């Protein structure tokens, strides 16, 4: 395993062994006025500034520079290049990493397999926005003459989290779309709760899947279909009401789908990473394409940052080393991503699996079984809700929890002649400055005294009243929550995965962890069938599926 | 900090040290056809049927042996009777814990300070009954004489995630309600995307409050109110459009709200057990009382199930050492709930506070710091959703990770003959095989080979191709997600958070986490008016604040 055999890292470890422990944020600050300056980065977009203040990190100048090194000696920067110049680095599929060139609106040739790929992205693109162009003017037509009022985009994993996640982050910038509606469970109920919502005559699904025999989705798919006949009677119409992102061409025309509206996209366009292809198609159709150009765009700035940028002051690579620290070093099993925003509430939901599928992995490049950890378990909420949920734990539970809060300087509602985000700001800002500073017993013991406790009173409370703070942070606030820095934000957590993952040695754009579930499933779904018990699995498999089947037949009130 | 100085507790470590690492799924399975027979419990509760299937944990009989001796050398029967008894078992606040009063079918006494509470408990219930009859019938009548048919429920942790998440999860239930709508976020993309979807005539809003001075509710509920006055003018109006769950009847009336609407609860309600008491007037207004009922009646059939079995075979009692030993023994910082039904879509978001603002905590009800793990993260995301968003992680990262996989045997929409339903049901049985199983080096490199790949391909493949497995969850089935079953579920879990509690001599029932951030919020609110440089805090929060200010007035192009 790299990571271990590697000299830089055992630097690392070894110092964390010696010094950790004795790292305070509270000591750090008071002796240092110069903190901030020293862990922050601004970063001027041109369309809005981001701020990245790593300070209230467990670091200093010398762990910063240990790690910085250890990025370098992990090759970070060429394993960056041969990512962006789309050399196969999917090693275990043999496949490009290219969701960069997705959004190259530079249109810079990336060559794989001999052709500059950058053509064919933009044909798609061009395509989308005609389309986009034909149903939110009204000009596209469902079977009985009528305007679309309602894109329906079905589809499992990064065919659906991403679009969603970003429609409702964008949803300011929707005037004049449709509204957009996500199916992705199998479980029935989402597809028709969804269904009952919907006039067949004026709307449009989107099938979302690359090989268009995505079982989840296809059989999604066929119930909208069904449900849209139950009133169109004639399948020539199915063509006016679905169209498809899939380079399943066959299997499309199958469907009923004119294949003039297939939307391809490519393999090196991992799911978890394809919002900013043909997969975009609803988000396009929400907001516009010119917002969707402008998401583009972020995220391409993003990329240019990551390129171009020595990495002391890269954004990506030191978000990623920060990781690195409290993984591989503090042993941190999660990473909290908290934004202090409404719209933003899937935020967190996206990157667990943007994160998570592709760090949770337990296999080198080399076939080496890994001997550290890897990928953390990440989760959140939107600010303050979460803070009104777990954040007891963060401060005074008996686990180092690593937080980014986010929050926009500017919000998309300022009503109350901007009082909510007074409100919001405030508590996004004393949230991180109470997870470092905590409170002592002696200055907790003052405010027991003057608010009247008795001694035993105080006696009892004071415990429990001690923040011992010292909790890591990192704060992120940018100007606004515009398409476009959306787009930056997006990108910059995208490949701050793709550091970790070099660091590691690991292949953070396959999924091989799926194939046994798929597998195990297709053989349990016909034994549920019929009334005799299952007895070929081991014994809970069995009675689980007994249980299921005993009961199915019950009537309950 | 005793748990530590308890000798049961010191036995299973030292056990654990020295066999934990051997344990074996699989091989525990392959030589014990009677595991699951063993392992298992089945709960006819007279309204449906709750399998709890526990054979897929690392553990033998042996381990739950000395997992229950441990349960009882801490007092979990005792301590149980204290809360059942409406003891003070709050030690910090000096309060009694009694939700499980709320939903006291049976109407046993519960004495207080000298008085039984149910007579009090029935009156709210009483009223809450008549108020929701008046509603739904059209009777009770908005300023214009239109009948209600929009519910907005406005308020904070307790006071929301509970309504929302069972309102979420019985919609089905809600043949004849009014539409309701939660509103929690300070931030005011919240309220203002909400309220632009009502018309003021027919919308009632419920403003949840024990205080009526919670400084995010309030604000929300005055922007609302003003939004409300914007169109219906006088502010004697007030009083047919809000309605209050709270005890502060000046501040209520204050507000323009009539106090013969003011619904009350008690200080031995915790907001993270609320939804039982008048809290939950949105769920009853949208399902009716009767369902509202079979929902307290199901929390009391499980609280009953909870108080009358022996430790062996009680299921709280089950989850709550199973956990335990994850978490104090392997050291697991997280434990998933993955409900495989997509109505249940926020039942982990309820839990993550249910469970981590109960027992995040450091500090024991003797005021000793603890010196062992105390309440674990939980979260989680509803199959197969979350299937397709992190899995990989659980399946092939480098960490042990507890899950709960929940499901009904019966759907709510089982349409296309019951094919979606069937398919989610073989997933739900094929993960937790999965995880179990795994699939050896041997089993995978058969397979390639069988695939026709090359020595040199294959080698470089198989290793990433080999699930180790041995993931140990819980699959809870029950026959059907009505109001009666779920209320048992909800109870369930929280007797599991109660019974770790104890265990860990922590009070569950506190939440002093929140001040720190709570102070810290006030003090920087009127800072942040204005374009003077902030100085007076460490040089991060100053900066932050400073970057707020420069960029407010920041023109974006």
Same mark, same amino acid.
Not at 67 to 80: F, H, Y
Not at 225 to 230: E, G, I, P
Not at 425 to 434: C, D, G, I, S, V
């Given at each position: 395993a790299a990571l271990t055999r590697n000299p830089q890292f055992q630097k690392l470890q070894q110092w964390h062994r010696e010094h950790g422990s004795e790292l305070n944020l509270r000591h750090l600050f008071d002796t240092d006025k110069e903190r901030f300056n020293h862990f922050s980065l601004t970063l001027n977009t041109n369309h809005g500034h981001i701020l990245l203040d790593y300070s209230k990190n467990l670091?200093?100048?010398?762990?910063?520079?240990?790690?910085?090194?250890?990025?370098?000696?992990?090759?970070?920067? %060429?394993?960056?290049?041969?990512?962006?110049?789309?050399?196969?680095?999917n090693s275990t599929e043999d496949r490009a990493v290219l969701h960069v060139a997705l959004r190259n609106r530079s249109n810079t040739p990336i060559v794989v397999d001999g052709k500059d790929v950058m053509p064919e992205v933009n044909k798609v693109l061009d395509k989308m926005k005609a389309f986009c162009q034909r149903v939110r003017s009204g000009d596209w037509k469902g079977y009985t003459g009528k305007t679309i009022t309602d894109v329906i985009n079905i589809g499992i994993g990064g065919s659906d989290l991403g679009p969603l996640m970003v429609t409702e982050a964008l949803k300011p910038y929707s005037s004049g779309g449709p509204r957009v509606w996500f199916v992705s469970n199998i479980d029935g109920t989402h597809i028709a709760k969804t269904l009952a919502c919907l006039n067949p005559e004026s709307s449009l699904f989107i099938?979302?899947?690359?090989? /268009?025999?995505?079982?989840?989705?296809?059989?999604?798919?066929?119930?909208?279909?069904?449900?849209?006949? $139950?009133?169109?009677?004639? !399948?020539?119409?199915?063509?006016?009401?679905?169209?498809?992102?899939?380079?399943?061409?066959?299997?499309?025309?199958?469907?009923?789908?004119?294949p003039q509206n297939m939307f391809e996209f490519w393999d090196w366009v991992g799911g978890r990473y394809s919002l900013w292809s043909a997969i975009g198609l609803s988000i396009a159709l929400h907001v516009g394409f010119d917002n969707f150009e402008q998401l583009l765009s972020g995220a391409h700035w993003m990329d240019q940052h990551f390129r171009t940028t020595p990495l002391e002051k890269n954004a990506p690579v030191?978000? %990623?080393?920060?990781?690195?620290?409290?993984?591989? =070093? /503090?042993? =941190?099993?999660?990473?909290?991503?908290?934004?202090?925003?409404?719209?933003?509430?899937? /935020?967190?939901?996206? /990157?667990?699996?943007?994160?998570?599928?592709?760090?949770?992995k337990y296999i080198t490049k080399?076939?080496?079984?890994?001997?550290?950890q890897t990928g953390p378990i990440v989760w959140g909420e939107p600010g303050t809700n979460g803070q009104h949920a777990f954040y007891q734990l963060i401060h005074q539970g008996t686990k180092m929890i690593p937080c980014d809060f986010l929050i926009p300087v500017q919000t998309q509602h300022p009503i109350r002649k901007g009082l909510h985000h007074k409100?919001?700001?405030?508590?996004? $800002?004393?949230?991180?400055?109470?997870?470092?500073?905590?409170? +002592?017993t002696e200055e907790a013991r003052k405010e027991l005294q003057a608010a009247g406790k008795s001694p035993?009173?105080?006696?009892?409370?004071? !415990?429990?009243?001690?923040?011992?703070?010292?909790?890591?942070?990192? +704060?992120?606030?940018?100007?606004?929550?515009?398409?476009?820095?959306?787009?930056?934000?997006?990108?910059?957590?995208?490949?701050?995965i793709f550091v970790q993952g070099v660091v590691w040695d690991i292949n953070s754009f396959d999924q091989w962890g799926v194939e046994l579930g798929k597998q195990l499933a297709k053989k349990i779904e016909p034994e549920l069938d019929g009334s005799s018990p299952v007895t070929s699995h081991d014994s809970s498999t069995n009675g689980l599926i007994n249980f299921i089947k005993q009961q199915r037949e019950a009537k309950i009130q």
């Open positions: 670091v200093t100048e010398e762990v910063m520079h240990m790690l910085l090194d250890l990025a370098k000696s992990r090759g970070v920067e %060429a394993a960056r290049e041969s990512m962006f110049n789309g050399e196969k680095i099938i979302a899947s690359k090989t /268009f025999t995505t079982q989840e989705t296809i059989t999604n798919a066929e119930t909208a279909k069904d449900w849209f006949l $139950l009133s169109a009677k004639d !399948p020539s119409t199915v063509a006016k009401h679905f169209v498809a992102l899939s380079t399943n061409t066959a299997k499309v025309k199958e469907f009923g789908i004119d030191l978000l %990623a080393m920060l990781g690195i620290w409290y993984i591989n =070093c /503090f042993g =941190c099993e999660t990473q909290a991503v908290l934004p202090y925003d409404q719209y933003l509430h899937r /935020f967190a939901a996206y /990157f667990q699996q943007g994160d998570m599928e592709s760090n949770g080399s076939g080496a079984r890994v001997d550290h409100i919001l700001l405030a508590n996004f $800002l004393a949230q991180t400055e109470a997870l470092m500073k905590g409170k +002592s035993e009173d105080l006696m009892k409370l004071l !415990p429990h009243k001690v923040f011992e703070g010292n909790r890591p942070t990192n +704060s992120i606030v940018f100007t606004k929550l515009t398409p476009f820095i959306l787009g930056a934000l997006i990108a910059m957590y995208e490949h701050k």
